[PDB]
Design an enzyme around this catalytic site. Structure first.
Site, PDB file in Angstrom:
ATOM      1  N   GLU A 127       0.719  -1.324  -0.158  1.00  0.00           N
ATOM      2  CA  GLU A 127       0.057   0.082  -0.064  1.00  0.00           C
ATOM      3  C   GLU A 127       0.676   1.260  -0.016  1.00  0.00           C
ATOM      4  O   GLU A 127       0.644   2.366  -0.625  1.00  0.00           O
ATOM      5  CB  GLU A 127      -0.925   0.070   1.198  1.00  0.00           C
ATOM      6  CG  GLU A 127      -2.020  -0.990   1.260  1.00  0.00           C
ATOM      7  CD  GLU A 127      -3.094  -0.692   0.187  1.00  0.00           C
ATOM      8  OE1 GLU A 127      -3.071   0.238  -0.433  1.00  0.00           O
ATOM      9  OE2 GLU A 127      -3.979  -1.693  -0.100  1.00  0.00           O
ATOM     10  N   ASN A 169      -7.827   8.702  -5.521  1.00  0.00           N
ATOM     11  CA  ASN A 169      -8.578   7.904  -6.548  1.00  0.00           C
ATOM     12  C   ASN A 169      -9.398   8.779  -7.458  1.00  0.00           C
ATOM     13  O   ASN A 169      -9.654   9.858  -7.283  1.00  0.00           O
ATOM     14  CB  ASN A 169      -9.629   7.176  -5.448  1.00  0.00           C
ATOM     15  CG  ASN A 169      -8.833   6.526  -4.279  1.00  0.00           C
ATOM     16  OD1 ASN A 169      -8.992   6.736  -3.207  1.00  0.00           O
ATOM     17  ND2 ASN A 169      -7.913   5.845  -4.894  1.00  0.00           N
ATOM     18  N   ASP A 224     -12.514   8.476  -8.012  1.00  0.00           N
ATOM     19  CA  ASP A 224     -13.605   9.374  -7.277  1.00  0.00           C
ATOM     20  C   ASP A 224     -13.481  10.259  -6.615  1.00  0.00           C
ATOM     21  O   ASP A 224     -14.549  10.849  -5.931  1.00  0.00           O
ATOM     22  CB  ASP A 224     -14.541   8.202  -6.829  1.00  0.00           C
ATOM     23  CG  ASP A 224     -14.042   7.667  -5.305  1.00  0.00           C
ATOM     24  OD1 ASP A 224     -12.955   8.102  -4.772  1.00  0.00           O
ATOM     25  OD2 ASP A 224     -14.474   6.577  -4.801  1.00  0.00           O
ATOM     26  N   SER A 249     -11.869  10.783  -3.867  1.00  0.00           N
ATOM     27  CA  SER A 249     -11.369  10.369  -2.240  1.00  0.00           C
ATOM     28  C   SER A 249      -9.832  10.084  -2.406  1.00  0.00           C
ATOM     29  O   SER A 249      -9.291  10.135  -3.538  1.00  0.00           O
ATOM     30  CB  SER A 249     -11.915   9.182  -1.942  1.00  0.00           C
ATOM     31  OG  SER A 249     -11.742   8.154  -2.641  1.00  0.00           O
ATOM     32  N   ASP A 281      -6.594   8.251  -0.300  1.00  0.00           N
ATOM     33  CA  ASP A 281      -5.954   6.992   0.503  1.00  0.00           C
ATOM     34  C   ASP A 281      -4.683   7.800   1.385  1.00  0.00           C
ATOM     35  O   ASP A 281      -3.754   8.312   0.705  1.00  0.00           O
ATOM     36  CB  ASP A 281      -5.469   5.998  -0.224  1.00  0.00           C
ATOM     37  CG  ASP A 281      -6.544   5.183  -1.011  1.00  0.00           C
ATOM     38  OD1 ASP A 281      -7.724   5.507  -0.642  1.00  0.00           O
ATOM     39  OD2 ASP A 281      -6.315   4.322  -1.908  1.00  0.00           O
ATOM     40  N   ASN A 332      -9.002   5.085   3.318  1.00  0.00           N
ATOM     41  CA  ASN A 332      -9.509   5.986   2.181  1.00  0.00           C
ATOM     42  C   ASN A 332     -10.500   6.937   3.022  1.00  0.00           C
ATOM     43  O   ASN A 332     -11.417   6.546   3.522  1.00  0.00           O
ATOM     44  CB  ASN A 332     -10.393   4.801   1.245  1.00  0.00           C
ATOM     45  CG  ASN A 332     -10.754   5.496   0.067  1.00  0.00           C
ATOM     46  OD1 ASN A 332     -11.257   4.560  -0.883  1.00  0.00           O
ATOM     47  ND2 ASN A 332     -11.127   6.865  -0.084  1.00  0.00           N
ATOM     48  N   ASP A 361     -15.072  -4.648   9.547  1.00  0.00           N
ATOM     49  CA  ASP A 361     -16.478  -4.221   8.751  1.00  0.00           C
ATOM     50  C   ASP A 361     -16.981  -5.300   8.140  1.00  0.00           C
ATOM     51  O   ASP A 361     -18.221  -5.051   7.944  1.00  0.00           O
ATOM     52  CB  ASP A 361     -16.124  -3.074   7.963  1.00  0.00           C
ATOM     53  CG  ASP A 361     -17.044  -2.679   7.319  1.00  0.00           C
ATOM     54  OD1 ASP A 361     -18.165  -1.972   7.955  1.00  0.00           O
ATOM     55  OD2 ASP A 361     -17.216  -2.584   6.088  1.00  0.00           O
TER      56      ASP A 361
HETATM   57 AU   LIG Z   1      -9.887  13.509  -1.199  1.00  0.00          AU
END
Ligand SMILES: [Au+3]
Ligand SMILES: [Au+3]
Ligand SMILES: [Au+3]
Ligand SMILES: [Au+3]
Ligand SMILES: [Au+3]
Ligand SMILES: [Au+3]
Ligand SMILES: [Au+3]
Ligand SMILES: [Au+3]
Length: 129
Positions: A35, A46, A48, A50, A52, A59, A101
């Site tokens: 990672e 990302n 979208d 977002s 990380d 995220n 989760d």
């Molecule tokens: Au962001």
């Protein structure tokens, strides 16, 4: 901070991540390697919108607040910047919530694609723990 492999294994263990939710410390070290290459300041944007953050590339869509991820949650109740710290406490605490989760370490794409089912113990081999 860029951790050494055994150095990160020892830190992860002190913070209670070894065998957490059944995942041996090699799994966590392998996930961090792919990672973030063990760099606590790693960030990745990302498609979208977002981002990380940190050694485990947590995220903003769900887990932290960065103020620039519309409609997102902050389930770890932290600023995303806290995940960039030299001290991995915030990242470990959030990772514990993430791996509880439902889908386990499959939440980490790099874990699923590069660590899962491999000889993960190699990542802690030769470490004084
Ligand atoms: Au962001
Ligand atoms: Au192991
Ligand atoms: Au960065
Ligand atoms: Au958020
Ligand atoms: Au904000
Ligand atoms: Au936001
Ligand atoms: Au905040
Ligand atoms: Au599981």
């Amino acid at each position: 901070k860029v951790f050494g492999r055994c150095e990160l294994a020892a830190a992860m263990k002190r913070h209670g991540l070894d065998n957490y939710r059944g995942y041996s410390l090699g799994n966590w070290v392998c996930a961090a390697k792919f990672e973030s290459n063990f760099n606590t300041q790693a960030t990745n944007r990302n498609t979208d919108g977002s981002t990380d953050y940190g050694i485990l590339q947590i995220n903003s869509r769900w887990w932290c607040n960065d103020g620039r991820t519309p409609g997102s949650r902050n389930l770890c109740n932290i600023p995303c910047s806290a995940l960039l710290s030299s001290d991995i406490t915030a990242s470990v605490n959030c990772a514990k919530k993430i791996v509880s989760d439902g889908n386990g370490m499959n939440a980490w794409v790099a874990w699923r694609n590069r660590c899962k089912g491999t000889d993960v113990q190699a990542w802690i081999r030769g470490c004084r723990l």
